């Protein structure tokens, strides 16, 4: 009766630069890994990455988290970045 982990985040945008606040957690265990796709061909295994887009646009950012039993969940959010 493992509970699958909770994937969640919020983005902070500053022109084309973005930072992630990671709210992911496991109610009954621990998170072991993080897999981000920034929607522009760039990816990360960091918990709370900072990145920058090279051009303005709307992108889908995805985060997959894994718990201590190997269960996963994915949450995605669109974001918009503009040149300053």
List interacting residues with Ca ion (CB under 5 A): 2-3, 26, 28-29, 67
Nearer Cβ to Ca ion (29/49): 29
Nearer Cβ to Ca ion (3/78): 3
61 touches, from Ca ion, Zn ion, none (C-beta below 5 to 8 Å by class): none
Q: Please give the size of the binding site for Zn ion, defined by CB under 5 A.
A: 1
User: According to CB under 5 A, which residues from 53 to 82 bind Zn ion?
Assistant: 82
Question: C-alpha angle with apex 74: 1 to 68, nearest 5 degrees?
Answer: 45
**What are the start-end ranges of the E strands in 1-84?**
9-14, 17-22, 31-37, 43-44, 50-52, 57-67, 72-81
Q: How many CB atoms neighbour CB 59 within 10 A?
A: 20
């Amino acid at each position: 009766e493992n509970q699958a982990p909770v994937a969640n985040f919020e983005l902070k945008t500053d022109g084309l630069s973005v930072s992630a606040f990671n709210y992911s957690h496991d109610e009954d265990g621990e998170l072991v890994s993080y897999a981000w796709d920034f929607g522009n061909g760039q990816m990360s295994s960091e918990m709370a990455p900072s990145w920058s887009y090279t051009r303005a646009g709307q992108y889908t950012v995805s985060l997959t988290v894994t718990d201590d039993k190997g269960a996963t969940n994915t949450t995605t959010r669109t974001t918009q970045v503009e040149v300053p």
